Scaffold this active site. Structure first.
Site, mmCIF file in Angstrom:
data_model
loop_
_atom_site.group_PDB
_atom_site.id
_atom_site.type_symbol
_atom_site.label_atom_id
_atom_site.label_comp_id
_atom_site.label_asym_id
_atom_site.label_seq_id
_atom_site.Cartn_x
_atom_site.Cartn_y
_atom_site.Cartn_z
ATOM 1 N N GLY A 164 -4.569 -0.214 2.168
ATOM 2 C CA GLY A 164 -3.831 0.910 2.181
ATOM 3 C C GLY A 164 -4.131 1.959 1.029
ATOM 4 O O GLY A 164 -5.006 1.682 0.583
ATOM 5 N N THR A 165 -3.305 3.111 1.038
ATOM 6 C CA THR A 165 -3.395 3.986 -0.107
ATOM 7 C C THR A 165 -3.130 3.556 -1.447
ATOM 8 O O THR A 165 -2.216 2.721 -1.474
ATOM 9 C CB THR A 165 -2.754 5.222 0.418
ATOM 10 O OG1 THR A 165 -1.495 4.943 0.341
ATOM 11 C CG2 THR A 165 -3.297 5.551 1.563
#
Lengths: 233, 86, 242, 241, 233, 243, 243
Positions: free
Chosen positions: G30-31
């Protein structure tokens, strides 16, 4: 395909449900090819020694360069493929090295290949998840059960054989029969000739066809009838 | 060495097409956005099916619908044996 | 050997895909919706001559102006009709009117996919979805005569002429060129029996087939065995012409 | 309790918990019955392997749900006690709710309707027994014979049998018995059931139980000596003809 | 493929993904195609309706929530009706309790809480139908894109369905056009017609196939069916 | 039937497979600690290991305070450690309101052991991968230490320890009690008891620790507290002066 | 055996869990998000990767704020990250109801800690594959915590996890040596934007977004709000100057 400058698929994929005559389609290709055909059994790759199966792989690919434009066919690869990891019974590490030898000889460091490779088995779910991904295979075809229009042609190719009474519609027989593999479809025409003895009939009539519905199909269901029963394990 | 990213797949698909013949009207950044987490060989396998589609239709060059129809066919994480829309 | 909520690689539930295949395993139900009425019919498919014509009833009555037919396994059909009449007759008590045919189809189709094991958020107890296909027909004062199809997948479409069961393929394509917007009520009765005669093993009679009708005045009505026999005799004259 | 589902659609479209449950009926005692104009006769056999079974203390194979209607099943005896008790409670519950005596049509659709629940209820298994409900509606002399299948499908039959050697008896009842001209006497209805039991019971007496159903809430159970009386008359006209 | 690791909803794959989320995600890509966009003062929702027969009707792909908002479904139809009941319940909940209309931003968070409960617990399943949430409030028009996992992200416009991702090319080049168009609802509706036309292959847009629902400030949510969209074709 | 090893059931060898792996989970963190019984009190020490500089030394602790009269030290992963920590604090509060006065040490180790026995017998709950060690001073039996095993078996110890080196650490505490033939340290002051356990820990591990490398809990009568960085460093000053 | 990695409660032969290890790999997909702890308060920053131009600028808020005193940022699956805050939102509402004054930072960490622990103890549910970083200004000083998928957490002077976890968090060690005495809240905002660009080397293949939010007693006085106005644009030019 040389005009477009593309790459033809090296491998193919044929699995399907058991009983559709998949091995019959592999022999139909060898007739039109008019070249060398190689049929390989999955249990043949495993020998009575550890490590001999690795030499058995190169035996098949050595004839590819020696004899050009041939066909190799693998049968029942489920007994070979699959990762199966480690923590299991422990005697499973000998079989998993056969594919690692087969994958290396197929796509290795040097992309050496000419002919077409055919993988076939009855259990696609138990195979190696790497074997189930492309780059060793492009065309993927899975067999399905013929519909009312599909099952009609199954009895038409058999109508030229045996004895068919004039004025009998085979579309009603395949309609009364539920969805089933081609193995049980050809059993209708074969058993229909058996009623010519005990049931006191000359040739196969429409009445003997209706008796086969409750016999060839409904009578033989019971247990131990595969068709679509086992799709997985 | 994880799976390729979004914009990274746009450069991979363009390299495997150097030996093919197209009209250069196809946006490669558009085809990469239609592919979500596919293997590197699954990317090259799309160009293989795109050439086989033009052979059945008799096209002299690979058009845009060849790569689009190849995704609808079986390449990466796509398998359909029937329409089945209800 | 898995849960009923497990999705197939195609993006569908295994309980949904295998439920649609059970429709062809049963009898064949054919019906046609016209502007003057909806002609519905089924096939009893008697396996023995000793079976009574009043035994298997594949056409029930939800309302005087609303009726439906069943095909395939009738075990799941009887349960749906109890809920169909519940969502209909009780709806009459609430709004003091007749429930819409399309609105009644939504309430019946929503009870299909609510199954599961230990469903969170509320209490839903069902082992398997309904494996029966229902053709919902009726008439209202706005849209008119409509014929729907209740699928095990929870979706429904409005069909002018629909053939389910074993005739969902061969008998379904034959109704494309034989249907017309000007088809009347009398001509639709002979058109259904014309298809039912060719798709049946033995000859067409009142014991092996039962047809119904839905009109604006008389509403839901089942053809008598004497009334059905009169339409069969008129069908034989239409088969032989030139 | 147990929330896990059992019945699951087979890839062919059928259900394993249904078809495999039907084999329990075919391995049980055959139950054959017929209906006449003024009377209905339900025959049933017993297990010929076990002996030293007193008939009086042994529960009858034909369960009486109501005065005018009884139930003779074939199948698993473990799943039959659940259907017999719940059908008799509903018989009194119908008399309590609607103040009406039950009808053979309502009793069959109820028992078949309850079986539809367990097939659709997660955590339970379908019944492996098939019941035959036969009786007379109140103020009606018309014979009512309904078959109840473990799958939930019910239908009316003039002459129908279930259990082992069913297809042998079914082929015998089609040619010998005619639905267009049923016998109007009780004696002819009893002899018809005995003829169907000669190919299954295979020369036995104490293993045969025949229940006679008559209108106006009249039930007469044939004793051991009364059943063998009709057997002797048929055997004399069998080998000699 | 099929079931190996994540076939159980509570199991994680060794690659850090979830196949059950991917299985339900592929249901939208194989479903009905739909597009959408929005402007400052207006929002346009265009959906395509299909069926299995010419004589059959077309099931509506647009479900109305309230007068100020609407949505569309691409996926299994009955799975969207359950999510639509939870969204309409929150619209009346905020209307009775808070005397306010449900905001688009808060509707995405409440919709995400419904799907995350079935994915994190055994016995449930994620909804394999997509939802494009349109609406208007005092802030402005907002558009959302729902996924089987429950991800909610505000976008100018997007497309979910068969060949829908390829239709985004027209929305990217025109992204600077419709965002600056205010007070012209006719041009904003025609912008969505040219976007969905890029995914048309077999059949084109017709009277019964085209379904357009526009929402805005002075114009509430209205579903245009039949001949109402015939002038915008 | 390869699922027999994945849950708690009777094995063909007459043992429990999942219970054997519960003891192996405590060696993942590799944290060595020990506890000894003083004269009038009990002092427990633990090795404080901080992998990254971004961690606050005051926040990271392996010694938790259940109540004012009872301390606790747990070995193994922190998530299973703090799971039973809040469960032990709830049992200490329910015993004060409902049952009576403050809970002693043996009752807290017995209730937490019986709680894990229910989780071990039931197949839908996995056993805790940590070990509960409670130290306190009772008003009747005096100082006592009860070490609760993850299998749900509690037994009293004179001087206990934990970690993979426990078997090497136990030899140090065992040989000291065999020569003096005493079951507890005769030092009355709690300050000398702190430096007593630290001396045997340094010679056993062969490593000189620092103020941030150790956490020393001190359980007195009806009082419990954790020594700060200045209190732990002060003990190391007199150790180098005497020996 | 075979299948130890299938369900949750099944332990590995070495005393670990596979499903917990598989949830860690979902955090790095993910980010990325970082954090900075100071004396007056903490500073939150997250890099949101923009897929295509269809994203609307600065209309998406990934950080979900608990009351006014607690911000929460997560790196991992978005659906699993929102369920933790929604569960903590009810815990903060239930606390303020009975306990009056708002819940401090070290107290709020125990509510999310035990709640994740219950998911690892059941086979009917799955653990959270998202790592949530939360903090703020409590009643005494300040604290910062990072919740791992395993439920393990401690006090962090800084917390970073994501695709740039090997980069961004490695730069946090230089921040300690840069300001060993202390760091102001205003300077930490500009330093947080630089760390995003230092780990941007792996994010250069896509479009990014900068979202910074801080809370302290110097200016906001117990108010957690995002950075807007010219303060956000000022930190961009200062961070991009060294790039």
């Amino acid at each position: 395909f040389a005009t477009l400058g593309i790459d033809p698929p090296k491998g193919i994929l044929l699995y399907g449900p058991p009983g559709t005559g998949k091995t019959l389609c592999a022999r139909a290709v060898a007739n039109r090819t008019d070249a060398t055909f190689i049929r390989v059994i999955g249990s043949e790759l495993v020998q009575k020694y550890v490590g001999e199966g690795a030499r058995m792989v190169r035996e098949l690919f050595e004839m590819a360069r020696t004899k050009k434009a041939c066909i190799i066919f693998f049968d029942e690869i489920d007994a070979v493929g699959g990762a199966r990891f480690d923590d299991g019974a422990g005697g499973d590490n000998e079989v998993q090295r056969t594919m690692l030898e087969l994958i290396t000889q197929l796509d290795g460091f040097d992309p050496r290949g000419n002919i077409k490779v055919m993988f076939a088995t009855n259990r696609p779910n138990t195979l190696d998840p790497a074997l189930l991904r492309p780059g060793r295979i492009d065309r993927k075809v899975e067999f399905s059960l013929p519909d009312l229009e599909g099952r009609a042609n199954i009895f038409r190719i058999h109508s030229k054989s045996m004895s068919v009474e004039r004025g009998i519609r085979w579309e009603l027989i395949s309609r009364l029969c539920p969805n089933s593999t081609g193995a049980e479809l050809r059993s209708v025409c074969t058993e229909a000739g058996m009623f010519a003895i005990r049931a006191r009939r000359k040739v196969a009539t429409e009445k003997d066809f209706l008796k086969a519905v409750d016999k060839v199909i409904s009578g033989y269901k019971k247990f131990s009838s595969t068709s679509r029963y086992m799709q997985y394990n | 060495f994880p799976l390729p990213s979004e914009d990274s797949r746009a450069q991979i698909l363009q390299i495997h097409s150097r030996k093919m013949t197209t009209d250069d009207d196809i946006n490669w950044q558009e085809l990469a956005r239609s592919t979500d987490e596919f293997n590197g060989a699954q990317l090259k396998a799309v160009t293989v099916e795109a050439g086989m589609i033009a052979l059945r239709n008799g096209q002299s060059s690979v058009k845009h619908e060849d790569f689009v129809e190849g995704i609808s066919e079986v390449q990466a994480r796509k398998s359909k044996s029937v329409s089945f829309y209800a | 050997d898995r849960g009923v909520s497990t999705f197939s690689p195609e993006g569908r539930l295994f309980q949904v895909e295998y439920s649609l295949e059970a429709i062809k395993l049963g009898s064949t139900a054919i019906g046609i919706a016209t502007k003057e009425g909806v002609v519905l019919g089924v096939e009893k498919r008697a396996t023995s001559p000793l079976l009574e014509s009043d035994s298997i009833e594949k056409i029930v009555e939800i309302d005087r102006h609303i009726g439906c037919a069943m095909s395939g396994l009738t075990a799941d059909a009887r349960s749906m009709i109890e809920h169909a009449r519940t969502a209909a007759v009780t709806h009459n008590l609430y709004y003091d009117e007749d429930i819409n045919v399309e609105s009644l189809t939504q309430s019946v189709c929503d009870l299909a996919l609510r199954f599961g094991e230990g469903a969170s958020g509320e209490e839903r107890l069902m082992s398997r979805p309904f494996g029966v296909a229902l053709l919902i027909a009726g008439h209202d004062a706005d849209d008119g005569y409509q014929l729907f199809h209740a699928e095990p997948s929870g979706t429904f479409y409005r069909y002018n002429a629909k053939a389910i069961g074993s005739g969902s393929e061969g008998a379904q394509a034959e109704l494309l060129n034989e249907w017309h917007s000007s088809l009347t009520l009398k001509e639709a009765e002979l058109l259904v029996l014309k298809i039912l005669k060719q798709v049946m093993e033995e000859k067409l009679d009142e014991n092996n087939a039962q047809l119904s009708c839905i009109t604006k005045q008389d509403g839901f009505k089942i053809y008598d065995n004497e009334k059905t026999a009169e339409l069969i005799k008129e069908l034989k004259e239409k088969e032989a012409a030139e | 309790g147990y929330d896990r589902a059992l019945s699951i659609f087979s890839p062919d479209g059928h259900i394993f918990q249904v078809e495999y449950a039907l084999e329990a009926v075919k391995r049980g005692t055959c139950a054959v019955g017929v209906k006449g104009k003024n009377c209905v006769v339900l025959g049933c056999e017993r297990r010929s392997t076990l002996k030293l079974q007193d008939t009086r203390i042994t529960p009858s194979k034909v369960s009486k749900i109501d005065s005018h209607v009884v139930l003779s099943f074939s199948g698993l005896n473990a799943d039959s006690r659940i259907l017999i008790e719940k059908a008799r409670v509903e018989a009194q519950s119908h008399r309590l709710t609607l103040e009406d005596p039950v009808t053979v049509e309502y009793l069959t659709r109820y028992v078949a309707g309850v079986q539809q629940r367990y097939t659709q209820s997660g955590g339970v298994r379908p019944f492996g027994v098939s019941t035959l409900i036969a009786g007379f509606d109140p103020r009606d002399d018309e014979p009512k014979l309904y078959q109840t299948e473990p799958s939930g499908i019910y239908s009316s039959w003039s002459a129908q049998t279930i259990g082992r050697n069913s297809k042998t008896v079914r082929e015998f009842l089609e040619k010998n018995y005619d639905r267009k001209e049923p016998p109007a006497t009780v004696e002819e209805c009893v002899k018809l059931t005995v003829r169907s039991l000669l190919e299954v019971v295979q020369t036995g007496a104490k293993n045969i139980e025949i229940t006679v159903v008559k209108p106006d809430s009249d039930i007469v159970a044939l004793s051991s000596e009364e059943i063998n009386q009709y057997v002797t008359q048929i055997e004399q006209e069998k080998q000699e003809q | 493929f099929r079931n190996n690791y994540d076939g159980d909803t509570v199991t994680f794959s060794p690659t850090g993904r979830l196949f059950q989320v991917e299985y339900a995600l592929e249901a939208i890509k194989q479903g009905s195609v739909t597009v959408g966009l929005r402007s400052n003062t207006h929002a346009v929702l265009v959906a395509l309706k299909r069926n299995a027969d010419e004589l059959s009707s077309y099931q509506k792909k647009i479900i109305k929530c309230d007068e100020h908002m609407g949505l569309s479904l691409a996926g299994l139809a009955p799975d969207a009706r359950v999510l639509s009941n939870y969204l309409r319940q929150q619209c009346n909940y905020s209307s009775l309790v808070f005397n306010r209309k449900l905001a688009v931003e808060r509707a995405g968070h409440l919709l995400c809480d419904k799907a995350q409960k079935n994915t994190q617990s055994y016995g449930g399943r994620p909804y394999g139908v997509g939802l494009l949430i349109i609406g208007y409030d005092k802030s402005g028009a907002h558009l959302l894109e729902f996924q089987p996992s429950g991800n909610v992200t505000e976008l100018y416009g997007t497309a979910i369905g068969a060949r829908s991702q390829g239709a985004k090319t027209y929305l990217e080049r025109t992204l600077d056009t419709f965002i600056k168009i205010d007070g012209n609802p006719d041009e904003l509706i025609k912008a969505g017609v040219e976007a969905i036309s890029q995914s048309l292959r077999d059949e084109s847009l017709t009277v019964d196939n085209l379904s357009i629902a526009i929402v805005g400030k002075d114009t509430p949510f209205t579903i245009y069916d039949g001949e109402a969209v015939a002038k915008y074709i | 039937a390869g699922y027999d090893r994945h849950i708690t059931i009777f094995s063909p060898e007459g043992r429990l497979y999942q219970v054997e792996y519960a003891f192996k989970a405590t060696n993942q963190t590799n944290i060595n600690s020990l506890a000894v019984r003083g004269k009038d009190c009990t002092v427990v020490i633990s090795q404080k290991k901080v992998p990254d500089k971004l961690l606050d030394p005051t926040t990271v602790s392996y010694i938790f305070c259940i109540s004012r009269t009872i301390g606790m030290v747990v070995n193994g992963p922190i998530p299973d450690a703090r799971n039973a920590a809040l469960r032990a604090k709830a049992e200490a509060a329910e015993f004060r309101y409902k049952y009576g006065y403050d809970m002693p040490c043996d009752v807290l180790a017995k209730r937490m052991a019986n709680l894990s026995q229910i989780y071990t017998q039931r197949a839908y709950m996995r056993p805790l991968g940590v070990i509960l060690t409670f130290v306190s001073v009772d008003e009747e039996l005096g100082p006592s230490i009860y070490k609760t095993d993850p299998a749900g078996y509690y037994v009293g110890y004179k001087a206990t320890a934990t970690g993979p080196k426990q078997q090497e650490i136990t030899t140090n505490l065992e040989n000291h009690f065999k020569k003096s033939k005493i079951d507890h340290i005769n030092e009355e002051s709690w300050e000398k008891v702190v430096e007593f356990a630290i001396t045997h820990m340094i010679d056993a591990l062969g490593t000189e620790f620092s103020k941030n490398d150790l956490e020393v809990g001190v359980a007195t009568k009806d009082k419990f507290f954790t020594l700060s960085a200045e209190n732990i460093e002060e003990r190391l000053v007199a150790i180098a002066e005497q020996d | 055996g075979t299948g130890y990695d299938l369900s949750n409660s099944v332990f590995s032969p070495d005393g670990r869990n596979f499903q917990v290890e598989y949830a860690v790999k979902a955090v790095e997909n993910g980010t990325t998000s970082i954090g900075i702890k100071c004396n007056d308060g903490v500073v939150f920053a997250v890099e949101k990767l923009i897929t295509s131009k269809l994203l609307v600028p600065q209309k998406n808020v990934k950080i979900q704020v608990v009351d006014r005193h607690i911000g929460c940022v997560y790196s991992g699956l978005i659906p699993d990250g929102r369920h933790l805050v929604n569960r903590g939102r009810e815990e903060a509402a239930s606390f303020k109801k009975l306990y009056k004054t708002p819940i401090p930072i070290p107290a709020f960490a125990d509510r999310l800690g035990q709640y994740v622990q219950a998911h690892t103890l059941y086979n009917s549910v799955r653990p959270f594959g998202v790592s949530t970083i939360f903090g703020g200004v409590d009643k005494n000083g300040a604290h910062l915590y990072m919740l791992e998928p395993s439920g393990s957490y401690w006090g962090y002077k800084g917390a970073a996890t994501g695709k740039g976890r090997q980069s961004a968090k490695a730069e946090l060690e230089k921040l300690v040596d840069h300001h060993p005495e202390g760091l102001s809240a205003r300077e930490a905002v500009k330093q947080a934007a630089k760390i995003i660009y230092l780990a941007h080397e792996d994010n250069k293949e896509k479009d990014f977004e900068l979202e910074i939010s801080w809370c302290s007693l110097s200016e906001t006085n117990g108010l957690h709000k995002f950075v807007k106005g010219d303060l956000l644009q000022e930190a961009i030019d200062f961070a991009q100057k060294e790039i």
